[PDB]
């Protein structure tokens, strides 16, 4: 489905082509800092940027998810987590993607990439994907 | 001014280093078709892309320039021009360009790049130049 100019700008941004397809994780840390689900306002122009960088060769559908660690209650960190991908996707929209064509997921502590008994993997752990699928 | 990557994005474009700045030319009659300032549905969409492609390299201050070949009134085509160029800034504002950094101007038929003599060169004229400021 991913044209080859659309597969460079998606290597050079960083994401690596995974199950869901092309995929790249970015920092809770970096997005949020101490907030909940505000993001940090040089994130926010962090993420809008990718998004025009996307949108520049007509990528034009994403799948946000949402991730936490698995410290803290289990229902609190899948809203959080449903909460901080939806952030992301507000901005998305506002840099010009379809709202139509942008899916929203919180996966709370779920789907780990690292073992959440390191603080540096429960780290991440903590994290919103945005992912571009291959179809 | 312009970092590696960021001019990496202007040579992706076309952009040649001009006396102005780096400057690529899109062709009126691509932009603009039998219309007169309105731009063609698909070419304000090419443009939302190059605003875009500039935007995400932090490339937030255009100037855009609107030239005309030499037929007709000088005073006509000097105005056409501008309205040209600034139906390019529209489109540049709406994409997230900040309007303060986007310099607008109609040169009419004061700044050839080809002999007016032929149509593929009066073509040629009939252009709006994106111009980066380095």
């Known amino acids: 489905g991913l044209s080859a100019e659309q597969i460079a700008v998606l290597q050079e941004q960083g994401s ?8 790249f994780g970015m920092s ?10 505000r993001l940090n306002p040089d994130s926010r122009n962090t ?10 060769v007509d990528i034009d559908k994403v799948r946000l998810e949402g991730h936490t660690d698995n410290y803290g209650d ?4 899948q809203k959080l987590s ?4 939806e952030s992301v996707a ?27 008994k ?8 903590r994290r919103v994907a ?4 291959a179809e």
């Open 16 to 23: 690596e082509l995974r199950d869901e397809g092309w995929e």
């Open 28 to 37: 809770s840390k970096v997005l949020f800092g101490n907030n909940l689900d």
């Open 47 to 56: 993420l809008t940027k990718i998004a025009r960088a996307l949108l520049a």
């Open 74 to 77: 289990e229902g609190y960190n």
């Open 82 to 85: 449903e909460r901080r991908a």
């Open 90 to 116: 507000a901005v998305f929209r506002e840099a010009g993607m379809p709202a139509a064509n942008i899916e929203v997921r919180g996966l709370g502590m779920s789907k780990p990439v690292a073992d959440n």
């Open 118 to 125: 390191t603080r540096a993997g429960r780290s991440e752990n």
């Open 130 to 133: 945005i992912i571009v699928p």
